Coordinates of C-alpha atoms in Angstrom, one line a residue:
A1006 CA 0.4 0.1 0.3
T1007 CA 1.3 3.5 -0.3
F1008 CA 1.1 5.9 1.7
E1009 CA 1.5 9.5 0.7
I1010 CA 2.5 11.9 3.6
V1011 CA 2.9 15.7 3.2
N1012 CA 3.8 18.5 5.3
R1013 CA 1.7 21.0 4.6
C1014 CA 2.9 23.2 8.3
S1015 CA 5.3 26.4 7.8
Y1016 CA 7.3 24.5 9.9
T1017 CA 10.0 21.6 8.8
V1018 CA 9.1 18.1 10.6
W1019 CA 10.2 14.0 10.7
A1020 CA 8.1 12.3 8.9
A1021 CA 8.1 8.0 11.1
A1022 CA 6.8 4.6 10.0
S1023 CA 6.7 2.0 12.7
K1024 CA 4.2 -1.2 13.5
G1025 CA 6.1 -0.7 16.6
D1026 CA 8.8 -4.0 16.3
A1027 CA 9.9 -2.7 12.8
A1028 CA 10.4 0.5 10.3
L1029 CA 7.8 0.8 7.9
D1030 CA 10.0 1.2 5.0
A1031 CA 12.3 4.0 5.4
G1032 CA 10.9 4.4 8.6
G1033 CA 11.2 8.4 8.6
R1034 CA 12.5 11.2 7.2
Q1035 CA 12.6 14.8 6.4
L1036 CA 9.8 17.1 5.1
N1037 CA 10.7 20.5 4.6
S1038 CA 7.3 22.8 4.6
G1039 CA 5.7 21.5 1.4
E1040 CA 7.3 18.1 0.6
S1041 CA 5.5 15.2 0.2
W1042 CA 6.9 11.6 0.7
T1043 CA 5.9 8.7 -0.6
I1044 CA 6.0 5.4 1.6
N1045 CA 5.1 1.6 0.7
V1046 CA 3.3 -0.3 3.3
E1047 CA 3.6 -4.5 3.5
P1048 CA 0.4 -5.4 3.1
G1049 CA -1.3 -7.3 6.2
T1050 CA 0.7 -5.1 8.5
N1051 CA -1.3 -4.4 11.6
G1052 CA -0.9 -1.6 14.4
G1053 CA 1.3 0.6 12.0
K1054 CA 1.4 4.1 13.0
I1055 CA 2.8 7.6 11.1
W1056 CA 3.7 10.6 13.1
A1057 CA 5.5 13.9 12.8
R1058 CA 8.2 14.9 14.8
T1059 CA 9.4 18.3 15.5
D1060 CA 12.6 20.2 16.7
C1061 CA 14.1 17.9 15.7
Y1062 CA 18.6 17.6 14.6
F1063 CA 20.6 14.1 13.0
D1064 CA 24.4 14.0 12.6
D1065 CA 25.6 12.2 9.6
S1066 CA 24.6 8.4 10.8
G1067 CA 21.1 9.3 11.2
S1068 CA 21.2 9.5 14.8
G1069 CA 20.2 12.7 17.4
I1070 CA 17.0 13.9 19.1
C1071 CA 13.7 15.6 18.4
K1072 CA 11.6 17.5 20.7
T1073 CA 8.1 15.5 20.2
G1074 CA 8.6 11.9 18.8
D1075 CA 11.4 10.6 18.6
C1076 CA 12.1 7.2 18.4
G1077 CA 15.2 6.6 20.2
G1078 CA 17.0 9.3 18.0
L1079 CA 17.1 7.8 15.2
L1080 CA 16.1 9.2 12.0
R1081 CA 15.0 6.5 10.7
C1082 CA 12.4 4.7 13.3
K1083 CA 12.1 2.1 14.4
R1084 CA 9.9 1.9 17.3
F1085 CA 7.2 4.5 18.2
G1086 CA 7.5 8.1 19.0
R1087 CA 8.2 9.5 22.3
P1088 CA 4.6 11.7 23.2
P1089 CA 3.6 13.6 21.9
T1090 CA 2.5 12.7 19.1
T1091 CA -0.2 12.4 16.7
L1092 CA -0.9 9.3 15.6
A1093 CA -3.0 8.4 12.1
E1094 CA -2.8 4.3 12.9
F1095 CA -4.2 1.7 10.7
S1096 CA -3.5 -2.2 10.3
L1097 CA -4.2 -3.1 6.6
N1098 CA -5.5 -6.3 4.5
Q1099 CA -7.3 -7.7 8.4
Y1100 CA -10.6 -10.5 6.8
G1101 CA -10.2 -8.6 3.6
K1102 CA -10.9 -5.3 4.8
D1103 CA -8.5 -1.9 5.7
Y1104 CA -8.8 0.6 9.0
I1105 CA -7.8 4.0 10.0
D1106 CA -8.2 6.2 12.7
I1107 CA -6.1 8.8 14.7
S1108 CA -5.5 9.0 17.7
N1109 CA -4.8 10.9 20.8
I1110 CA -4.2 8.8 23.3
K1111 CA -0.3 9.8 23.3
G1112 CA -0.5 13.5 23.3
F1113 CA -1.3 15.8 20.5
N1114 CA 1.9 18.0 18.7
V1115 CA 0.9 18.3 14.8
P1116 CA -2.4 18.8 13.2
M1117 CA -3.5 15.8 10.5
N1118 CA -5.3 14.4 8.0
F1119 CA -5.3 11.0 7.3
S1120 CA -7.7 10.2 4.0
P1121 CA -8.2 7.4 1.3
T1122 CA -6.8 8.1 -1.7
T1123 CA -8.7 5.6 -3.5
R1124 CA -12.5 4.6 -3.2
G1125 CA -14.8 2.8 -1.3
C1126 CA -14.5 5.2 2.2
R1127 CA -13.8 9.0 4.3
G1128 CA -10.8 10.1 5.8
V1129 CA -10.4 11.2 9.2
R1130 CA -9.0 14.2 10.6
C1131 CA -7.7 16.0 13.7
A1132 CA -7.0 19.8 12.7
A1133 CA -8.0 21.8 15.7
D1134 CA -5.5 24.0 17.7
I1135 CA -5.0 21.8 19.8
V1136 CA -1.5 23.0 21.5
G1137 CA -2.4 26.2 21.7
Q1138 CA -5.5 25.8 23.9
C1139 CA -4.0 23.0 26.0
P1140 CA -4.6 23.0 29.2
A1141 CA -1.8 24.2 31.7
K1142 CA -1.6 20.5 33.1
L1143 CA -0.8 19.2 30.1
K1144 CA 1.6 21.3 28.3
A1145 CA 4.8 20.1 27.6
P1146 CA 7.8 21.9 28.4
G1147 CA 9.8 20.1 25.3
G1148 CA 6.8 21.4 23.2
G1149 CA 2.8 20.1 22.3
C1150 CA -0.3 19.2 24.2
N1151 CA 0.6 15.4 26.2
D1152 CA -1.9 13.2 27.4
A1153 CA -3.2 12.4 31.5
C1154 CA -1.4 9.0 31.3
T1155 CA 1.7 10.7 30.2
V1156 CA 1.2 13.2 32.8
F1157 CA 0.1 11.5 36.0
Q1158 CA 0.4 7.8 35.7
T1159 CA -2.7 6.9 36.8
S1160 CA -4.7 3.5 36.2
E1161 CA -7.7 5.5 35.3
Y1162 CA -5.8 7.7 32.6
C1163 CA -4.2 4.9 31.5
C1164 CA -7.1 2.2 31.8
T1165 CA -4.0 0.2 32.9
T1166 CA -7.0 -2.8 33.9
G1167 CA -10.1 -1.7 30.6
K1168 CA -12.3 -0.8 33.0
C1169 CA -11.4 3.4 32.7
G1170 CA -13.4 6.2 31.9
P1171 CA -14.0 9.6 29.9
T1172 CA -11.6 11.9 32.2
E1173 CA -11.9 16.6 32.1
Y1174 CA -8.9 15.5 29.8
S1175 CA -10.2 13.7 27.7
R1176 CA -12.8 15.5 27.3
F1177 CA -10.4 18.2 26.1
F1178 CA -8.7 16.1 23.6
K1179 CA -12.5 15.1 22.4
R1180 CA -14.3 18.4 22.4
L1181 CA -10.9 20.0 20.0
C1182 CA -10.7 16.6 18.0
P1183 CA -15.0 15.0 18.3
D1184 CA -12.8 12.2 15.0
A1185 CA -10.1 11.0 17.3
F1186 CA -9.9 8.5 19.9
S1187 CA -9.0 11.0 22.9
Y1188 CA -9.1 7.1 25.4
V1189 CA -8.4 4.0 25.8
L1190 CA -12.3 3.0 25.7
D1191 CA -13.6 6.0 23.9
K1192 CA -16.4 5.9 21.3
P1193 CA -14.5 4.4 18.2
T1194 CA -13.4 6.1 15.3
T1195 CA -12.5 4.0 13.3
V1196 CA -13.0 3.8 9.1
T1197 CA -13.3 0.6 7.4
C1198 CA -12.3 1.0 3.9
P1199 CA -12.1 -1.2 1.2
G1200 CA -8.4 -4.2 1.5
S1201 CA -6.1 -2.8 -0.2
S1202 CA -6.3 1.4 0.1
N1203 CA -3.8 4.0 -0.4
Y1204 CA -4.2 6.6 2.0
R1205 CA -2.1 10.0 2.5
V1206 CA -1.0 11.6 5.7
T1207 CA -0.9 15.2 6.1
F1208 CA 0.2 17.5 7.9
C1209 CA -0.6 21.0 9.1
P1210 CA -3.8 20.3 6.5
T1211 CA -6.0 23.1 7.9

C-alpha cells in the first residue's frame, strides 16, 4: 500500500512510520514545508502508525534527537515515538478490510488529516489548535500537548485494567477533535476501508 505523507505545515517535520517492532519503509525522513514523501507499507501490516516529529537534529549517521515523537534517537524509526504525538493508525488487510483512525491517546503535537486516496471510505481529521488550547497541566515543556496518562501515570488515565471512563482531560481532546480517539475506551472513530486501499497523511491540513 502507498502512503503519501505531505507536510503542509509552515515548519519542517520529520515524518516517522513504524509498527512498533520494525520500521515501515525507511521508517523516517525529513519533510520541509510543502514536501511530499511516498512510502510503501506491506499488505497485512497490523498496528502501523505514522506521526510527525518536530525540532529534530540528526548527525550524518542518522542519530540524534527530536522534541516530539523521538524514536530512540533515530532518523529512521524502528519503534514508536515519544509523546506527545498525534497518531495516524492503521491495520491493513485484516480479514479483507483496512482500518484507519487518528488517536490523541499519546497526546498531540501536529494537526493531521488521514484520508484514503482510493474509493470506498472517508478520511479522518484532527486539525484543531490543540497545542494552543492545551490545558496548563498537560502542556509539554518540550513542545505539544501531553495526554493525561503520560503526565499522571494513573490506572484511570492509562486504562491499565481495561475499565476506565472519560475524564476532564480526555474530554478536552474530544471537544477539540471529535473524530480522534481521546482515551483508550473512547467510542471508536475507526473507519473501515476496502482492503488494500492507499492513503495520504497530511500534516497541517488547514
